[PDB]
Nucleic acid binder design. Structure first.
Lengths: 35, 122, 117, 138, 191, 164
RNA sequence: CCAAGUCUGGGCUAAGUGGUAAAGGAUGUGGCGCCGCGAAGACAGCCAGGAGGUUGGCUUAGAAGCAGCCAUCCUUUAAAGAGUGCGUAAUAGCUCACUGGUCGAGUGGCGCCGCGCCGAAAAUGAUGCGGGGCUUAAGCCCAGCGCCGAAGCUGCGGGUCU
RNA sequence: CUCGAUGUCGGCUCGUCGCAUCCUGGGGCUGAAGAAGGUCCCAAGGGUUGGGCUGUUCGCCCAUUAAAGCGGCACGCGAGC
RNA sequence: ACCGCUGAAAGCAUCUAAGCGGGAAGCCCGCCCCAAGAUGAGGCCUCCCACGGCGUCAAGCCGGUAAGGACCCGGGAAGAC
């Protein structure tokens, strides 16, 4: 969502690279981190 | 047929007389009120305050138009006049009674109510 | 069909660059180069963005038009022709070269095809 | 570096209006602090503020000391339009000479205050440098 | 010849059950000229004279079944088109000509207070100042009447021979009776 | 760094590795952009990079291989869950005939290779020959039929949970 | 395209960056220093208790880590967990911050960098100057080497003023 | 740049781009069950209505509607009114 | 966009660089409308045969072949001409 400025929720929410892209991931709809 | 401010009498008794045609009811564009159709106009004048009253925001339908209606029966029908009936959101008349005949139509687009009240449906 | 044997060449793998380059080189001077290979051809990795640029030849459509060929055949059309000008010789120099698909006479097959191949 | 008309004819002799220096707590060794590298008539206000919000998030022991302070100022629109411009003051600060000793998060073991200041940098404006002092930070 | 076609009979409606207007169409089997194939090399149109008597005054189903009637001797009666079907026909506009941006192209003209002023018919404008001269956009008095017109969802109702002729569902053949009609039921949707 | 137990006929040509076995008749591909590894009684990773990068590159193949095998011999199995207080299924035709409202259930076919099973209407699952080609299709239906975890019901990957 | 090394040497790119941008992010990638250990056989996997006086103070109608304001100590023992954590009405399960068997040889951390991807959306139609180019493609950094190219400088010869 | 001169507001017509998208599809989010809303990412195809009073645009009001979009181009257009 | 599968490097996970799929009124195709003057003038069938005399690579001057066309006339929802 935040497109710009993502940084680790749940004590897990991972750091993944898709299309060089960095989009938050972690066992929660409440983390759908993306930029 | 019948829009902007073309006028048309009553045949029911709702307590009216004649009514100005605001919008043709249906959805955007649309430019026409042909019997069966439903109009968004008001009172140009109504009896001595029956129940309606001059200049009353309104909702009425199509039943008399000298515009001539082509019956799927390659037939043709029209009238000496142009007017219709009021209604209760629920495509339901008010006039307790009818007046000049009308046309199958109505039925086809819901209204029986008048369909039969009518003195004669042509 | 069959022709001369003047400029007897082909293509495949190589670098879709200097490739044409000389093609003309002799494209100039005053020679005819009929080869072929298209597909086989070759050109920058980064396929992806690889097939992009030339899709930039793809839908580059300008009312006034702007076709932008859709078969290897072209790719080389452009490019090459690129090497030259547009007054006489050059021009002609564009009729004097000719290539084709598989083989009529004794990564370079994806962008095309891709955008038309 | 355009600066003002004089220290007592235009606008010189003020308090600049702000929120004093020291906070946090002592600490003999532990060198915990902050400085910069950017040049900028440090935005007073912005300034004053910032630092403060700093205390807002911590509270007590962590040299919430801070070695800054504006003392001159700009000016602009007031009068005719654009031409012969008189001057109407507003917004003093101080030159953050391309880096230098900012404020200090100084104390034994109290990073619970390092993070703070941290929060203090975040804020600020001109980027900022996160650092330690003689020894580091413990 | 890949298809089937002839000319405009005319229009009239009448009968049915609710009633419905169509159009008549003339055409037995206008013989069979070669047939489409690009085999061994380039092949398309031959001509083993067998035509009319005057014609030298000027001297894979669709096409396939053809082979059926085009080898028979030439001609080929029209009408698979049967009871309730959708071919498509391509008339020829109608020598209507060069007209004003009026009917040629829908548009509102000279309003009132000036909707007469010995004023009238004539488009509103072209292009702005900075944009650039002109567009190939806004049509123009783009002549009409000749266009190779046609359409779709062309449903045929019935047919009979007495003279091989066809009855149609809604005419609009484009061109006029005695006119050049060609039909098909292309990528039908009503299928 | 692995093995090739019983029957694992192995042929690595051009870059393709042909593995023949019991109920695991399979012909897979395998990079020429690296180093093959096979010796008739084992096999493993080849270092055509030795460097972190390609390192993993095969550090993947490894598995890759591992697949061919276990795949060629003991085919694979995906455990599915039929959790629907209305939905339900039980093979029919050479495919499956699931159901879950709407009106038109659906027939799904495991093209040559894949093969589904209706142990018992409620639950089901697939047994192919390539964990790869399996897990996928296996799921490609597990969803196919909305698992909607709004409060519990639908196709779900074995070993799920609930919600609120 | 247009004249001149698809020179050689050794690094760095895997985005077409080059071919405009900032604050701001992130086990991208390559090169440098630190804390703990792998035979108290180490981090991620897995077996288990997943310890007791801890169920303290404001508010309690409920702090009793898992409402929040203050504590942060003691322990009989395999050590501890000021119990960072999903919860519910507080309690009630799991999770390492705690370690045995099984493996077994490199595993997690911050400082220093040089290259690089999100932030970075526009109006006629598209853009490195164009065709174009991914270990001489070519870019960028550090090294040696030879060729181009002004009307500038040498050779040719005339001109002309002081 | 133009004063040896580029005729300026609103309207009319004829429109053409653009996307930060009003309607429209596709999505992830929700303190989302349904339904309907809110949040934000992807997409411009097509489309986005009659009146009123105002020189006006703007704007308020009337009846619609899925919707009744923001803005370019001399806030497009006078050798077209 | 957006959702997944198979699995490295991170012996545990990951839509992921490589391998394979899901998914839009949108792009390409498809549906109508031109259209090789696209100087790359395209295909194909159906007709016509080697005429005269002159210096030349006379690819230059004449009767021709209704193969054939035209012009003039008479006519067309073909149409300013």
């Amino acid at each position: 969502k935040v497109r710009s400025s993502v940084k680790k929720m749940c004590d897990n929410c991972k750091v993944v690279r898709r299309h060089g892209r960095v989009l938050v991931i972690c066992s929660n709809v409440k983390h759908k981190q993306r930029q | 047929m019948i829009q902007q401010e073309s006028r048309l009498k009553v045949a029911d008794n709702s307590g009216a007389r004649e009514v100005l045609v605001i919008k043709v009811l249906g959805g955007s564009g649309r430019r026409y009120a042909n019997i069966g159709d439903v109009v968004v106009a008001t009172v140009k004048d109504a009896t001595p305050g029956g129940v309606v009253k001059k200049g009353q925001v309104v909702k009425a339908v199509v039943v008399r138009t000298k515009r001539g209606v082509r019956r799927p029966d390659g037939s043709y029908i029209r009238f000496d006049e142009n007017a219709c009936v009021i209604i209760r959101d629920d495509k339901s008349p008010r006039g307790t009674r009818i007046f000049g005949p009308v046309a199958r139509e109505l039925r086809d687009k819901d209204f029986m109510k008048i369909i039969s009240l009518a003195p004669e449906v042509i | 069909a069959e022709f001369d044997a003047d400029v007897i060449v082909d293509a495949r793998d190589c670098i879709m660059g200097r490739v044409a380059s000389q093609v003309a080189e002799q494209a100039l001077d005053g020679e005819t180069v009929a080869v072929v290979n298209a597909e086989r051809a070759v050109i920058t990795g980064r396929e992806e963005q690889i097939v992009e640029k030339y899709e930039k030849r793809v839908d580059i459509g300008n009312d006034n038009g702007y076709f932008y060929p859709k078969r290897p055949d072209g790719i080389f059309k452009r490019t090459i022709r690129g090497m030259l000008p547009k007054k006489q010789r050059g021009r002609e120099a564009f009729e004097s070269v000719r290539v084709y698909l598989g083989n009529p006479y004794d990564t370079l097959g994806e962008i095309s095809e891709t955008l038309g191949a | 570096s355009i600066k003002p008309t004089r220290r007592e004819y235009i606008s010189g002799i003020p308090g600049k209006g702000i929120a004093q220096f020291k906070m946090g707590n002592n600490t003999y060794p532990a060198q915990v602090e902050n400085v910069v590298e950017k040049p900028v008539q440090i935005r007073h206000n912005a300034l004053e503020a910032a630092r403060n919000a700093a205390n807002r998030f911590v509270q007590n022991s962590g040299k919430f000391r801070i070695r800054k302070f504006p003392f001159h100022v700009i000016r602009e629109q007031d009068g005719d339009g654009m031409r012969a411009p008189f001057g109407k003051s507003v917004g003093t600060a101080a030159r953050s000479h391309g880096a230098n000793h900012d404020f200090i998060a100084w104390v034994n073991p109290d990073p619970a205050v390092e993070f703070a200041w941290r929060r203090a940098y975040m804020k600020v404006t001109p980027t900022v440098n996160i650092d330690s002092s003689p020894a580091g930070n413990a | 010849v890949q298809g089937f076609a002839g000319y405009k009979a005319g229009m009239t409606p009448r009968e049915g059950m609710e009633t419905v207007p169509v159009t008549v169409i003339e055409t037995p089997p206008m013989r069979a000229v070669a047939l489409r194939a690009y085999e061994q090399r380039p092949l398309t149109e031959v001509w083993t004279d067998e035509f009319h008597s005057e014609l030298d005054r000027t001297l894979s189903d669709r096409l396939d079944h053809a082979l059926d009637i085009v080898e028979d001797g030439g001609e080929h009666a029209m009408n698979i088109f049967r009871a309730g079907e959708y071919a498509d026909v391509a008339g020829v506009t109608k020598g209507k000509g060069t007209q004003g941006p009026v009917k040629r192209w829908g548009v509102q003209k000279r309003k009132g207070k000036h909707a007469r002023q010995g004023w009238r018919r004539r488009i509103g404008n072209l292009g702005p100042w900075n944009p650039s001269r002109v567009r190939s956009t806004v049509p123009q008095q783009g002549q009409t009447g000749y266009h190779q017109r046609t359409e779709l969802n062309k449903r045929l109702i019935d047919i009979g021979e007495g003279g091989p002729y066809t009855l149609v569902k809604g005419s609009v053949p484009g061109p006029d009776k005695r006119l050049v009609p060609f039909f098909r039921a292309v990528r039908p949707n009503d299928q | 760094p692995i093995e090739i137990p019983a029957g694992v006929t192995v042929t690595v040509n051009g870059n393709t590795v042909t593995v023949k076995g019991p109920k695991g008749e399979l012909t897979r591909t395998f990079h020429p952009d690296m180093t093959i590894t096979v010796e008739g009684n084992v096999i493993t990773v080849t270092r055509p990079s030795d460097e972190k990068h390609h390192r993993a590159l095969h550090g993947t193949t490894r598995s890759l291989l591992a697949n061919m095998v276990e795949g060629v011999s003991k085919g694979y199995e995906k455990a599915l869950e039929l959790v629907g207080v209305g939905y339900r299924a039980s093979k029919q035709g050479k495919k499956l005939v699931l159901s879950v409202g709407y009106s038109h259930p659906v027939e799904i076919e495991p093209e040559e290779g894949l093969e589904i099973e209706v142990p018992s209407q409620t639950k089901i699952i697939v047994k192919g020959a390539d964990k790869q080609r399996v897990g996928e299709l296996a799921a490609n239906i597990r969803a196919v039929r909305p698992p909607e975890p709004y409060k519990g019901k639908g196709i779900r990957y074995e070993g799920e949970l609930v919600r609120l």
